[PDB]
Design a protein around this nucleic acid. Structure first.
Lengths: 236, 225, 50
RNA sequence: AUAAAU
């Protein structure tokens, strides 16, 4: 059931629906209407009285939202924060120095410009500069957010990244584990960080994820990893 | 009566100092330059001389402002619709209507549109808003309100496009003027819902702005009529 | 141990502050008068000449 | 009080 922009909505006006990506609430007419093209996903809880929705659509330009995991690059340093850009040609984001474990006004973090960081967006307003924090409260006692070292970063459309982070039925992480050991950071801003013990394995992972990003096939991806890790052998 | 009522630019009005004889005592009239006048130097026959000269085409008005008596007269020239008003410039203590251009975390920069006069009437500064020739000003986060000066959420106070009535504490640098909305009569005056996308909103509470049209309520810093 | 001295010191300190305040009012007034002297110095005779 | 306002 594909949904297009300007599409009629079945739900009644009196009963509210929680906002989801793709769904837009008009500030003027107060009507709730879809603005993106894709599959509508709705979750209903309880016998009656509450609802939630969003649209899974193909987009690649990230827009910061509360509680979104993103991988950013710190281009430059200001007085009290880092300037980090999640994406190219995109507005800069404000990362606080005090947004680190064991922070102090006397000792600034040792992060240098060009370092990769795993971060979550705390406050994101449409008309204000967005802000991220190294540690996210929601995940647990320890965020696991620290600047990445070495590895390789991969560009990926927002849909592919969201499926890789929230969907456990996505075979990509499984088919890569069947070939080599690897650690992976996943950003909702369409960035994927991959690192192995050897470069040839990281490179092989890069090439697979890229093709998987291109291919978008469950059947292809299992084979894709096969021919990729094979091709590295001969290339060696 | 001695000085011409109306003077064109470059017309001599009155010398530097003046005096008269009344009640058996010399009264000293001190002539001081004003808006429309300029004290310059003229020399005749090798003799130096300073006299008040009008610089604007207007009727001329004098007004007194402050043993042996003592006096002070203010000489000025007033022109006499289109209004220019250049003499008017943001100075410490004046009230100024501004519009929010951008929002940051620790401050909020705007641009100066009009300036409140003195006894309401205003002086509109005409400039191009699509160039940047318009005077820019910055409202600090500590100058938002007297209540809790330390922690102030700028997102819940102002908004891009909202009109803010403020008072300039100081000139600052060439880039930003200093603006405070600490008092009651200062704050967001005119604003619309959703950054101007929705309908008009009016000021009810000092920290709450509502819209009696769509029933929308947004958190702003409102002033008092 | 030197708290008695400190109490004495505060009393010693206090007297000086008081002396300064009385003096200050006088100083402001003179300025218009200073402006007067220049007019006095200039000859009345010239003014009729110019 | 072990290195402060790119």
């Amino acid at each position: 059931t594909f949904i297009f922009p300007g599409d009629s909505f079945p739900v009644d006006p009196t009963t509210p629906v929680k906002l989801g990506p793709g769904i837009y609430c008009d500030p003027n007419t107060q009507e709730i209407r879809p603005v993106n093209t894709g599959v509508l996903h709705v979750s209903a809880k309880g016998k009656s009285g509450v609802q939630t929705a969003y649209i899974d659509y193909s987009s690649k330009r990230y827009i910061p939202s509360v509680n979104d995991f993103v991988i950013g690059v710190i281009i430059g340093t200001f007085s009290d924060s880092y300037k980090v850009s999640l994406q190219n040609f995109s507005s800069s984001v404000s990362l606080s120095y005090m947004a680190f474990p064991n922070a102090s006004k006397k000792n600034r973090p040792t992060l240098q410009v060009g370092d990769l960081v795993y971060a979550r967006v705390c406050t994101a307003e449409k008309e204000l500069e967005a802000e991220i924090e190294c540690f996210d409260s929601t995940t647990g006692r320890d965020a696991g957010f620290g600047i990445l070292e070495d590895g390789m970063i991969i560009d990926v459309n927002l849909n592919f990244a969201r499926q890789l982070l929230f969907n456990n039925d996505f075979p990509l992480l499984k088919v890569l584990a069947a070939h080599t050991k690897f650690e992976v950071a996943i950003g909702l801003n369409g960035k994927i960080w991959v690192k192995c013990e050897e470069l040839s394995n990281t490179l092989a992972c890069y090439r697979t994820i890229m093709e998987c990003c291109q291919k978008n096939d469950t059947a292809a991806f299992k084979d894709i990893a096969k021919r990729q890790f094979k091709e590295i052998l001969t290339v060696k | 009566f001695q000085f011409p009522e109306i003077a064109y630019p470059g017309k001599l009005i009155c010398p530097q100092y003046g005096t008269e004889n009344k009640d058996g005592e010399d009264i000293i009239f001190n002539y001081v330059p004003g808006p429309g006048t300029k004290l310059i130097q003229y020399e005749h026959n090798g003799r130096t001389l300073e006299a008040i000269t009008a610089t604007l085409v207007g009727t001329v008005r004098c007004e007194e402002e402050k043993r042996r008596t003592v006096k002070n007269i203010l000489v000025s020239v007033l022109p006499g619709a289109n209004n220019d008003f250049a003499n008017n410039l943001p100075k410490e203590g004046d009230i100024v209507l501004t519009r929010v251009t951008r929002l940051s975390l620790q401050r909020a920069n705007v641009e100066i549109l009009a300036v409140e006069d003195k006894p309401a009437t205003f002086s509109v500064s005409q400039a191009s808003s699509d160039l940047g020739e318009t005077f820019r000003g910055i409202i600090r986060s500590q100058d938002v309100r007297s209540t809790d000066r330390d922690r102030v959420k700028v997102i819940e106070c102002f908004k891009p496009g909202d009109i803010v009535r403020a008072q300039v504490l100081s000139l600052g640098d060439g880039t930003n003027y200093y603006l405070t909305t600490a008092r009651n009569d200062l704050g967001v005056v005119f604003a619309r819902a959703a950054n101007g996308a929705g309908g008009l909103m009016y000021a009810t509470d000092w920290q709450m702005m509502t819209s009696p049209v769509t029933g929308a309520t947004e958190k702003r810093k409102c002033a008092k009529p | 141990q030197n708290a008695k001295l400190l109490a004495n010191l505060i009393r010693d300190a206090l007297r000086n502050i008081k002396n300064t305040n009385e003096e200050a009012t006088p100083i402001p007034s003179s300025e218009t008068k200073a402006d007067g002297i220049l007019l006095e110095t200039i000859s009345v005779p010239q003014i009729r000449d110019v």
